[PDB]
Amino acid sequence: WLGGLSRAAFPKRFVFGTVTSAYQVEGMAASGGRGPSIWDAFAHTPGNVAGNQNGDVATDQYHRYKEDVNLMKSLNFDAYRFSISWSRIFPDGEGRVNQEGVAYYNNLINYLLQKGITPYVNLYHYDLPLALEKKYGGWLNAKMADLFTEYADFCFKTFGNRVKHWFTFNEPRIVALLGYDQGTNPPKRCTKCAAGGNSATEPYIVAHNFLLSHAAAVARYRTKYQAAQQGKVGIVLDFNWYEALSNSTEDQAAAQRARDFHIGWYLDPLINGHYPQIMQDLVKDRLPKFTPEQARLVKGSADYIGINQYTASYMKGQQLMQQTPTSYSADWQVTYVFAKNGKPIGPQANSNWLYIVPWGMYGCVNYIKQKYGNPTVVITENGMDQPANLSRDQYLRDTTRVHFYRSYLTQLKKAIDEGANVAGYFAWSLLDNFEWLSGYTSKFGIVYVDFNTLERHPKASAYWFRDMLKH
Ligand SMILES: [Zn+2]
């Protein structure tokens, strides 16, 4: 069961929470004044999502939020990471405010605080207002810094007297990778893609604009709101672990190149004020240059670093070659490997990319501690999925998820006990929800959602957390 884990096994005041995102749980996608995001248009195109499903209703948290908050409190969590939908506040992404949308987040935030649950609020979670994509070209346009800052400003003004823990973005690497390299997420751009694109250049343009937009929003927070509000603003980054296939110079170099192209891409700017040296060397003039002033705005602009940690891969090296550029992915010059010494790195959850590798959590946290001067880290997502088509009972007996959290949290504890500055931990997800391309065929929740009736039923993993987290 608990394997020696409890609140006593983590630092004093360590924060435990659950996570959702707006599009994935809210529903009311085209109601309450909400304007469409790029994901509304994408999900409504036949063939884009499993079963042609979309987030129109999702879990209907929009109407059930008090139930869901009561549930998280009963499970002994301290905090709730959720996102604000940009197009629910500004249906066109700019200009007119949707007061009904504002009232919703006010009500949610107020109920959370009434129930002693700390709001950790993300401003952006894959859900660019469609109007901004069409008018400005979204994250390809440097104008996003101003547009996002004006959005962030409104949210600081409106909610910041109560909200003290902000994140700007969630996984800008995946936006760059899937939206602009592989072209499998909106705006579906890539070199060969019907929508247009260039997998060798656009992922880098997009990432740069995320970084500049983050820095601009934080500068605004610090100069205008911080003195009165006394809150903090961070950013959420995905980091999956990379382990050298062997101890050869070439495999070790490859594992490190992957770390740099994955997490260093954002962390080196945020902490050190420059892109990783290997990216400068390999990507060259396809990698934008921060001016000294921009680098100084970007450096130190995150009060904490959100890490989404799920899995680990073995990495195999090769001699670095002069190559015609094709994509961000090919720029790493690495070879993914999922077995060493005849054994897989881990069994898979429902998602093909998700190998259950608890030691990857220690890998990531230890690495950030040693390389980046031990910045304040929050584990902003960790979890695993069940497949579609199970019975209610099968969903509830999620013994693999129980084992997943015990193991991963034991490895996190190991890293913390070695001195890593980790302030909190958040389980993805509170609820089974809209899992993007997989739709409702992937179940990440500690609480089961019957998507016919919308009823919530805690799984064994929810009760595991309740037991582990009791005060
Ligand atoms: Zn409803």
Coordinates of C-alpha atoms and ligand atoms in Angstrom, one line a residue:
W1 CA 0.0 0.0 0.0
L2 CA 1.8 3.2 1.2
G3 CA 5.4 1.8 1.2
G4 CA 6.4 4.1 4.1
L5 CA 5.0 7.2 2.3
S6 CA 3.1 9.9 4.1
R7 CA 3.3 13.7 4.6
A8 CA 6.0 13.1 7.2
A9 CA 8.1 11.5 4.5
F10 CA 8.2 14.8 2.5
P11 CA 9.5 18.3 3.6
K12 CA 7.4 20.5 5.9
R13 CA 4.8 22.5 3.9
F14 CA 5.4 20.3 0.7
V15 CA 2.4 20.9 -1.5
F16 CA 0.3 17.9 -2.9
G17 CA -2.4 18.5 -5.5
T18 CA -4.2 17.2 -8.6
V19 CA -4.3 18.7 -12.2
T20 CA -6.7 19.3 -15.0
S21 CA -6.7 21.7 -18.0
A22 CA -9.6 23.8 -19.3
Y23 CA -10.4 22.1 -22.6
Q24 CA -9.8 18.7 -21.2
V25 CA -12.4 19.0 -18.3
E26 CA -14.6 22.1 -18.5
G27 CA -17.0 21.4 -21.3
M28 CA -19.3 24.3 -22.2
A29 CA -16.9 24.8 -25.2
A30 CA -19.4 26.8 -27.2
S31 CA -21.5 28.1 -24.3
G32 CA -21.2 30.7 -21.5
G33 CA -19.9 33.2 -24.0
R34 CA -16.7 31.1 -24.8
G35 CA -15.1 31.6 -28.2
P36 CA -13.4 28.7 -30.0
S37 CA -9.8 27.7 -29.5
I38 CA -7.6 26.1 -32.1
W39 CA -8.5 22.7 -30.5
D40 CA -12.2 23.3 -31.0
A41 CA -11.6 23.6 -34.7
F42 CA -9.1 20.7 -34.8
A43 CA -11.3 18.3 -32.7
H44 CA -14.4 19.0 -34.8
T45 CA -12.6 18.0 -38.0
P46 CA -13.6 14.3 -38.8
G47 CA -10.6 11.9 -38.3
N48 CA -8.5 14.3 -36.2
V49 CA -9.4 12.7 -32.8
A50 CA -10.3 9.1 -31.8
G51 CA -13.9 8.4 -32.5
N52 CA -14.4 12.0 -33.8
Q53 CA -14.7 13.1 -30.1
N54 CA -14.2 16.6 -28.8
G55 CA -14.2 18.6 -25.6
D56 CA -17.7 20.1 -26.1
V57 CA -18.9 18.5 -22.9
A58 CA -15.8 16.7 -21.6
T59 CA -16.3 16.1 -17.8
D60 CA -18.7 19.1 -17.6
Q61 CA -16.6 20.5 -14.7
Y62 CA -18.1 23.9 -15.6
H63 CA -21.3 22.8 -14.0
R64 CA -19.9 20.3 -11.4
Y65 CA -16.9 22.2 -10.0
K66 CA -18.2 22.2 -6.5
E67 CA -18.6 18.5 -6.5
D68 CA -15.0 18.1 -7.9
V69 CA -13.6 20.5 -5.3
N70 CA -15.4 18.6 -2.5
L71 CA -13.9 15.4 -3.8
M72 CA -10.3 16.7 -3.9
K73 CA -10.7 18.1 -0.3
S74 CA -12.0 14.7 0.8
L75 CA -8.9 13.1 -0.7
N76 CA -6.6 15.3 1.5
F77 CA -5.0 17.4 -1.3
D78 CA -3.6 20.9 -0.5
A79 CA -3.9 22.4 -4.0
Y80 CA -5.4 22.3 -7.4
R81 CA -3.7 23.0 -10.7
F82 CA -6.2 24.1 -13.3
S83 CA -6.0 26.4 -16.4
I84 CA -7.9 29.5 -17.5
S85 CA -9.3 29.2 -21.1
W86 CA -8.1 32.3 -22.9
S87 CA -11.1 32.3 -25.3
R88 CA -13.5 31.9 -22.4
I89 CA -12.2 35.3 -21.1
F90 CA -11.5 36.9 -24.4
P91 CA -13.6 35.1 -27.1
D92 CA -11.5 36.8 -29.8
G93 CA -8.3 36.6 -27.8
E94 CA -8.2 40.4 -27.5
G95 CA -10.7 43.3 -27.0
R96 CA -14.1 42.3 -25.6
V97 CA -14.2 40.6 -22.1
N98 CA -16.7 37.7 -21.6
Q99 CA -18.1 38.5 -18.1
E100 CA -19.8 35.1 -17.8
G101 CA -16.4 33.4 -18.3
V102 CA -14.8 35.7 -15.7
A103 CA -17.6 34.9 -13.3
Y104 CA -16.9 31.2 -13.7
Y105 CA -13.2 31.4 -12.7
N106 CA -14.1 33.8 -9.8
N107 CA -16.6 31.2 -8.6
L108 CA -14.2 28.3 -9.0
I109 CA -11.3 30.2 -7.3
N110 CA -13.6 31.4 -4.4
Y111 CA -15.0 27.9 -3.8
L112 CA -11.4 26.4 -3.8
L113 CA -10.3 29.0 -1.2
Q114 CA -13.5 28.5 0.9
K115 CA -12.6 24.7 1.0
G116 CA -8.9 25.3 1.9
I117 CA -7.5 24.3 -1.5
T118 CA -4.7 26.4 -3.0
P119 CA -5.3 27.4 -6.7
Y120 CA -2.3 27.0 -9.0
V121 CA -3.4 28.7 -12.2
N122 CA -2.2 28.1 -15.7
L123 CA -2.9 30.9 -18.2
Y124 CA -2.3 28.7 -21.3
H125 CA -2.8 25.0 -22.0
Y126 CA -2.8 24.3 -25.7
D127 CA -5.9 26.5 -26.3
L128 CA -4.9 29.5 -28.3
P129 CA -8.1 31.5 -29.3
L130 CA -8.9 30.5 -32.9
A131 CA -9.3 34.2 -33.7
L132 CA -5.6 34.8 -32.8
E133 CA -4.4 31.9 -35.0
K134 CA -6.4 33.2 -38.0
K135 CA -5.5 37.0 -37.6
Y136 CA -1.9 36.8 -36.4
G137 CA -0.7 33.3 -37.2
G138 CA -0.5 32.3 -33.6
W139 CA 3.0 31.5 -32.1
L140 CA 4.8 32.2 -35.3
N141 CA 4.1 35.9 -34.7
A142 CA 6.3 37.9 -32.3
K143 CA 3.2 40.0 -31.6
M144 CA 2.1 37.1 -29.4
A145 CA 4.2 38.6 -26.6
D146 CA 2.0 41.8 -26.5
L147 CA -1.2 39.8 -27.0
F148 CA -0.4 37.3 -24.3
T149 CA 0.9 40.0 -21.9
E150 CA -2.4 41.9 -22.2
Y151 CA -4.3 38.7 -21.5
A152 CA -2.0 37.9 -18.5
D153 CA -2.4 41.5 -17.2
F154 CA -6.2 41.1 -17.2
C155 CA -6.0 37.9 -15.2
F156 CA -3.5 39.3 -12.7
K157 CA -5.8 42.3 -12.2
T158 CA -9.0 40.3 -11.9
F159 CA -7.9 37.2 -10.0
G160 CA -4.5 38.0 -8.5
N161 CA -5.8 39.4 -5.2
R162 CA -6.8 35.7 -4.5
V163 CA -4.5 33.7 -6.8
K164 CA -0.8 33.7 -5.7
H165 CA 0.6 30.8 -7.8
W166 CA 0.6 31.4 -11.5
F167 CA 2.0 29.5 -14.5
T168 CA 2.2 31.1 -17.9
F169 CA 2.5 28.2 -20.4
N170 CA 2.2 24.4 -20.4
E171 CA 4.8 22.3 -22.4
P172 CA 5.8 24.8 -25.1
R173 CA 8.1 22.0 -26.4
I174 CA 5.1 19.9 -27.4
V175 CA 3.4 22.8 -29.2
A176 CA 6.6 23.3 -31.2
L177 CA 7.1 19.6 -31.7
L178 CA 3.6 18.5 -32.6
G179 CA 2.2 21.7 -34.0
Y180 CA 5.2 22.7 -36.2
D181 CA 7.6 19.8 -36.5
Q182 CA 5.5 16.7 -36.9
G183 CA 2.2 18.6 -37.7
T184 CA 0.0 16.2 -35.7
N185 CA -1.5 18.9 -33.4
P186 CA -3.0 22.2 -34.3
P187 CA -2.1 24.2 -36.5
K188 CA -0.9 20.9 -38.2
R189 CA 2.2 22.6 -39.7
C190 CA 5.2 20.8 -41.1
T191 CA 7.4 20.6 -44.2
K192 CA 5.0 18.2 -46.0
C193 CA 1.8 19.4 -44.4
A194 CA -1.3 20.6 -46.2
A195 CA -1.5 23.7 -43.9
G196 CA 2.1 24.6 -44.9
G197 CA 5.2 24.8 -42.7
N198 CA 8.8 24.0 -42.3
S199 CA 9.8 21.5 -39.6
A200 CA 13.5 22.8 -39.6
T201 CA 12.7 26.4 -38.7
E202 CA 9.2 26.9 -37.3
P203 CA 9.6 24.9 -34.1
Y204 CA 12.4 27.2 -33.1
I205 CA 10.5 30.4 -34.0
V206 CA 7.5 29.1 -31.9
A207 CA 9.7 28.3 -28.8
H208 CA 11.4 31.7 -29.0
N209 CA 8.0 33.4 -28.9
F210 CA 6.9 31.4 -26.0
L211 CA 10.0 32.4 -24.1
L212 CA 9.7 36.1 -25.1
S213 CA 6.0 36.0 -24.2
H214 CA 6.7 34.4 -20.8
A215 CA 9.3 37.0 -20.0
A216 CA 7.0 39.9 -21.1
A217 CA 4.1 38.7 -18.9
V218 CA 6.4 38.2 -15.9
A219 CA 7.9 41.6 -16.3
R220 CA 4.3 43.0 -16.3
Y221 CA 3.5 41.0 -13.2
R222 CA 6.6 42.2 -11.3
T223 CA 6.4 45.9 -12.3
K224 CA 2.6 46.3 -12.0
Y225 CA 1.0 43.6 -9.7
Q226 CA 3.6 42.0 -7.4
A227 CA 4.0 44.7 -4.8
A228 CA 0.3 44.6 -3.9
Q229 CA -0.4 40.9 -4.7
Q230 CA 2.8 39.2 -3.5
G231 CA 2.3 36.1 -5.7
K232 CA 4.6 34.1 -8.0
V233 CA 4.7 33.1 -11.7
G234 CA 6.4 30.1 -13.2
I235 CA 6.2 28.0 -16.4
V236 CA 5.4 24.4 -17.0
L237 CA 7.9 22.3 -19.0
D238 CA 7.8 18.6 -20.1
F239 CA 10.9 16.6 -19.2
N240 CA 11.2 13.0 -20.0
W241 CA 14.4 11.3 -18.8
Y242 CA 17.2 10.2 -21.2
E243 CA 19.7 7.5 -20.2
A244 CA 22.8 6.6 -22.1
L245 CA 22.4 3.1 -23.6
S246 CA 26.0 2.4 -22.6
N247 CA 28.9 4.3 -20.9
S248 CA 30.6 5.0 -24.2
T249 CA 31.6 8.6 -24.9
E250 CA 29.2 8.6 -27.8
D251 CA 26.1 7.2 -26.0
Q252 CA 26.7 9.5 -23.0
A253 CA 27.0 12.5 -25.4
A254 CA 23.7 11.4 -27.1
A255 CA 21.8 11.2 -23.9
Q256 CA 23.1 14.7 -23.0
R257 CA 22.2 16.1 -26.4
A258 CA 18.7 14.8 -25.9
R259 CA 18.5 16.5 -22.5
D260 CA 19.7 19.7 -24.0
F261 CA 17.3 19.7 -27.0
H262 CA 14.4 18.6 -24.7
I263 CA 14.7 20.6 -21.4
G264 CA 17.8 22.8 -21.9
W265 CA 16.0 24.4 -24.9
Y266 CA 13.9 26.3 -22.2
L267 CA 15.8 25.9 -19.0
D268 CA 19.1 27.4 -20.3
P269 CA 17.3 30.6 -21.4
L270 CA 15.2 30.7 -18.1
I271 CA 18.1 30.1 -15.8
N272 CA 21.3 31.1 -17.7
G273 CA 20.0 33.6 -20.2
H274 CA 21.1 31.7 -23.4
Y275 CA 20.2 28.6 -25.5
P276 CA 22.2 25.4 -24.9
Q277 CA 25.6 25.6 -26.5
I278 CA 24.9 22.3 -28.5
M279 CA 21.7 23.8 -30.0
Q280 CA 23.7 26.9 -31.0
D281 CA 26.4 24.7 -32.6
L282 CA 24.0 22.3 -34.4
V283 CA 20.9 24.5 -35.3
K284 CA 23.0 27.7 -36.1
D285 CA 21.1 30.4 -37.8
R286 CA 17.8 28.5 -37.6
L287 CA 18.0 29.2 -33.9
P288 CA 16.9 32.8 -33.1
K289 CA 19.3 34.9 -31.0
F290 CA 18.1 36.7 -27.9
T291 CA 19.5 40.3 -27.8
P292 CA 21.3 41.0 -24.6
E293 CA 18.2 42.9 -23.3
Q294 CA 15.8 40.0 -24.2
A295 CA 18.1 37.4 -22.6
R296 CA 18.2 39.6 -19.4
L297 CA 14.4 39.7 -19.4
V298 CA 14.1 35.9 -19.9
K299 CA 16.9 35.0 -17.4
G300 CA 15.4 34.7 -13.9
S301 CA 11.8 35.2 -15.1
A302 CA 10.5 32.0 -13.5
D303 CA 9.8 32.0 -9.8
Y304 CA 9.6 28.2 -10.0
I305 CA 9.9 25.6 -12.7
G306 CA 6.9 23.3 -13.3
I307 CA 8.1 19.9 -14.6
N308 CA 5.7 17.4 -16.2
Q309 CA 7.5 14.0 -15.7
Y310 CA 6.2 10.8 -17.1
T311 CA 8.7 8.5 -18.7
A312 CA 12.3 7.7 -19.7
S313 CA 14.2 6.5 -22.8
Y314 CA 17.5 4.9 -23.6
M315 CA 19.6 7.0 -26.0
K316 CA 22.2 5.7 -28.4
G317 CA 24.8 7.9 -30.0
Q318 CA 26.5 8.3 -33.4
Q319 CA 29.3 10.5 -34.8
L320 CA 28.1 14.0 -35.3
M321 CA 27.5 14.7 -39.0
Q322 CA 27.2 17.7 -41.2
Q323 CA 23.6 17.3 -42.4
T324 CA 21.0 19.2 -44.6
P325 CA 18.5 20.4 -42.0
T326 CA 15.1 18.6 -42.0
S327 CA 13.5 19.1 -38.6
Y328 CA 13.9 19.9 -34.9
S329 CA 13.7 16.2 -34.2
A330 CA 16.5 15.3 -36.6
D331 CA 18.7 18.1 -35.3
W332 CA 19.4 16.1 -32.0
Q333 CA 21.3 13.4 -34.0
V334 CA 20.3 10.7 -31.6
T335 CA 18.9 7.2 -31.8
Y336 CA 16.0 6.2 -29.5
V337 CA 16.3 2.7 -27.9
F338 CA 13.7 1.1 -25.6
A339 CA 15.7 -2.0 -24.5
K340 CA 19.0 -2.5 -22.7
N341 CA 20.6 -5.9 -22.0
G342 CA 17.6 -7.6 -23.5
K343 CA 15.0 -6.0 -21.2
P344 CA 12.6 -3.1 -22.0
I345 CA 13.2 0.1 -20.0
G346 CA 9.7 -0.4 -18.5
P347 CA 6.2 -1.8 -19.2
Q348 CA 3.8 0.5 -21.1
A349 CA 0.7 2.2 -19.8
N350 CA -2.2 2.6 -22.3
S351 CA -0.3 5.4 -24.1
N352 CA 2.4 4.0 -26.4
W353 CA 4.9 6.6 -25.4
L354 CA 4.4 6.1 -21.7
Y355 CA 6.9 3.6 -20.3
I356 CA 6.6 3.1 -16.6
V357 CA 10.1 4.0 -15.4
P358 CA 10.0 5.3 -11.8
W359 CA 13.8 6.0 -11.8
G360 CA 13.3 8.5 -14.6
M361 CA 11.7 10.8 -12.0
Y362 CA 14.9 10.7 -9.9
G363 CA 16.9 11.1 -13.1
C364 CA 15.1 14.3 -14.1
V365 CA 14.9 16.0 -10.7
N366 CA 18.6 15.1 -9.8
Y367 CA 19.7 16.5 -13.2
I368 CA 17.9 19.8 -12.9
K369 CA 19.4 20.1 -9.3
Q370 CA 23.0 19.5 -10.4
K371 CA 23.0 21.4 -13.7
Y372 CA 20.8 24.5 -13.0
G373 CA 21.8 25.5 -9.5
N374 CA 18.9 23.7 -7.8
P375 CA 16.1 26.0 -8.8
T376 CA 12.7 25.7 -7.1
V377 CA 10.9 22.8 -8.9
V378 CA 7.3 21.8 -8.8
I379 CA 6.3 18.4 -10.3
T380 CA 3.3 19.8 -12.1
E381 CA 2.1 16.5 -13.7
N382 CA 2.8 12.8 -13.1
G383 CA 0.5 9.9 -13.9
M384 CA -0.5 7.0 -16.2
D385 CA -3.5 5.9 -18.3
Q386 CA -5.9 2.9 -18.5
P387 CA -7.4 1.9 -21.9
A388 CA -10.9 2.3 -23.3
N389 CA -13.8 -0.2 -22.9
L390 CA -13.2 -1.4 -19.3
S391 CA -16.1 -1.9 -16.9
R392 CA -16.6 0.6 -14.1
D393 CA -15.2 -2.0 -11.6
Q394 CA -12.1 -2.5 -13.8
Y395 CA -11.4 1.3 -13.8
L396 CA -11.8 1.5 -10.0
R397 CA -9.3 -1.3 -9.3
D398 CA -6.4 0.6 -10.8
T399 CA -3.7 -1.3 -8.9
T400 CA -1.1 -0.5 -11.7
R401 CA -1.7 3.2 -11.0
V402 CA -1.4 2.7 -7.3
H403 CA 2.0 1.0 -7.9
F404 CA 2.9 3.8 -10.4
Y405 CA 2.4 6.5 -7.8
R406 CA 4.1 4.7 -4.9
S407 CA 7.2 4.0 -7.1
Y408 CA 7.5 7.4 -8.7
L409 CA 6.9 9.3 -5.4
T410 CA 9.5 7.0 -3.7
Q411 CA 12.0 8.1 -6.4
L412 CA 11.0 11.8 -6.0
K413 CA 11.5 11.4 -2.3
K414 CA 15.0 10.0 -2.9
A415 CA 15.9 13.1 -5.0
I416 CA 14.4 15.4 -2.4
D417 CA 16.3 13.7 0.5
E418 CA 19.5 14.2 -1.6
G419 CA 18.8 18.0 -1.6
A420 CA 16.7 18.7 -4.7
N421 CA 14.6 21.9 -4.2
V422 CA 11.2 20.4 -5.0
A423 CA 8.3 22.4 -3.5
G424 CA 5.3 20.4 -4.7
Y425 CA 3.7 17.5 -6.6
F426 CA 0.6 17.3 -8.7
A427 CA -1.1 14.1 -10.1
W428 CA -2.3 14.1 -13.7
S429 CA -5.2 13.8 -13.5
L430 CA -8.0 14.4 -10.9
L431 CA -10.4 13.0 -13.5
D432 CA -10.5 10.8 -16.6
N433 CA -10.8 13.5 -19.3
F434 CA -10.4 14.5 -22.9
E435 CA -6.9 13.1 -23.8
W436 CA -6.3 15.2 -26.9
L437 CA -5.7 12.9 -30.0
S438 CA -6.9 9.8 -27.9
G439 CA -10.1 11.6 -27.0
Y440 CA -11.9 9.6 -24.2
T441 CA -10.0 6.3 -25.1
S442 CA -7.3 7.2 -22.5
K443 CA -8.1 7.3 -18.8
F444 CA -5.5 9.2 -16.6
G445 CA -7.7 10.0 -13.6
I446 CA -7.5 9.0 -10.0
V447 CA -11.2 9.5 -10.2
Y448 CA -13.3 7.6 -12.7
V449 CA -15.6 9.5 -15.0
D450 CA -18.5 7.7 -16.6
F451 CA -18.7 9.5 -19.8
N452 CA -22.3 8.5 -20.4
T453 CA -23.8 9.7 -17.1
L454 CA -20.9 12.0 -16.1
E455 CA -20.8 10.5 -12.6
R456 CA -17.5 10.5 -10.6
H457 CA -16.2 7.5 -8.8
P458 CA -12.9 7.5 -6.9
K459 CA -10.5 4.8 -8.0
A460 CA -8.2 2.8 -5.6
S461 CA -5.4 5.4 -6.4
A462 CA -7.6 8.2 -5.1
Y463 CA -8.0 6.3 -1.8
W464 CA -4.3 5.6 -1.8
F465 CA -3.7 9.4 -2.0
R466 CA -6.3 10.0 0.7
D467 CA -4.5 7.5 3.0
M468 CA -1.0 8.8 2.2
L469 CA -2.0 12.5 2.6
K470 CA -4.0 12.5 5.8
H471 CA -3.0 15.4 8.1
Ligands
ZN1 ZN -23.8 20.7 -17.6

